Amino acid sequence: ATFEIVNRCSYTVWAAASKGDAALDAGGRQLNSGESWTINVEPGTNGGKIWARTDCYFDDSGSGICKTGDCGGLLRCKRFGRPPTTLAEFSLNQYGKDYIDISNIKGFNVPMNFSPTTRGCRGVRCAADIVGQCPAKLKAPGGGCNDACTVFQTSEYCCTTGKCGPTEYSRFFKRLCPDAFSYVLDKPTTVTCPGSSNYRVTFCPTA
Numbered sequence: 001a002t003f004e005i006v007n008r009c010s011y012t013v014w015a016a017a018s019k020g021d022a023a024l025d026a027g028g029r030q031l032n033s034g035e036s037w038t039i040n041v042e043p044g045t046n047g048g049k050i051w052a053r054t055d056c057y058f059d060d061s062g063s064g065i066c067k068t069g070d071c072g073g074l075l076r077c078k079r080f081g082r083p084p085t086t087l088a089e090f091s092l093n094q095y096g097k098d099y100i101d102i103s104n105i106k107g108f109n110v111p112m113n114f115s116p117t118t119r120g121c122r123g124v125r126c127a128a129d130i131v132g133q134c135p136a137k138l139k140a141p142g143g144g145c146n147d148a149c150t151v152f153q154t155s156e157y158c159c160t161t162g163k164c165g166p167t168e169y170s171r172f173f174k175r176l177c178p179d180a181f182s183y184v185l186d187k188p189t190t191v192t193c194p195g196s197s198n199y200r201v202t203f204c205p206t207a
Contacts, residue, residue: 001041001092002198004117005050007031009204013052013110016069016077017041024048027076030056031203043093043196050088051081052110052203054143067142068109083107084144086126086180088114088201098193102126103181104173108134109144113205121193127206128176135172147173147183159184 003024005015013031017024017039025039041048053066062075069081084107091099101124102114108130115123134145148157148169156164166174166183174182179189 001043001045001098001196002117003039003041003050004200005031005037005039006200006202007033007035007052007204008202009033009052009110009207011054012056013054013203014056014058014066014069014075015050015201015203016053016071016081017048017050018071018077018080019045019048020080021078023076023078024050027078028053028071028074030075041090041092045090045092046094048090048092049080050090050114050201051085052112053081054109068140068144080106083150084109084140084146086110086112088112090199093195096195098195098197099190100124100193100199101181101188101190102177102179104130104177105147105149105181105184107138107140107145107147107150108173108177109140110203111205111207113200113202115200115202116193116197117200118194118197120197121191124179124189124191125205126177126180127204130173130176133172133176135169138169138172145173157183
């Protein structure tokens with residue numbers, strides 16, 4: 001499957017693409033404002049994620065740091081990024097279907113549109129100003145809005161027992177982005193696409 005990753009932000013982001021134990025394609029790249037990066041994701045890829053990283057410094061070897069979504073100091077992510085990270089999440093060719101979503105479960109750094117570029121389903125978007133509205137206790141100093149699980153490390157926020165409810169904090173994410181997961185047991189906003197759909201992830205779709 002092809003993913004076009006477009007940075008419509010006025011600021012540089014460092015795109016990342018990982019399935020948690022491995023890079024997707026190159027796994028990361030600098031996107032200046034307006035730049036597009038096309039990656040190939042193996043069919044059957046399960047638990048793929050795409051995210052943006054902000055305020056990165058990388059040396060000549062691809063080692064450094066981001067203020068959001070840092071994946072162990074690498075330009076080319078092999079691992080998932082450090083919250084806060086707005087997540088494009090996908091499982092491809094799962095019994096003839098693709099499953100896509102946006103998640104705020106790991107917080108929010110950069111607004112995002114996650115849309116198919118092929119026919120047969122709709123995109124999802126989380127483009128509200130979650131950083132601007134972020135409750136005081138979830139504000140990440142580096143930039144972004146942490147989920148409550150990252151900040152407080154409770155069973156209720158992290159849903160550790162597999163039993164938990166919405167929270168004041170999950171409802172803030174859900175109110176600003178109803179089409180994204182706000183907590184682990186949120187009513188699914190997963191979209192079902194045809195197997196082997198192609199996609200565009202757009203950072204700062206509107207701004």
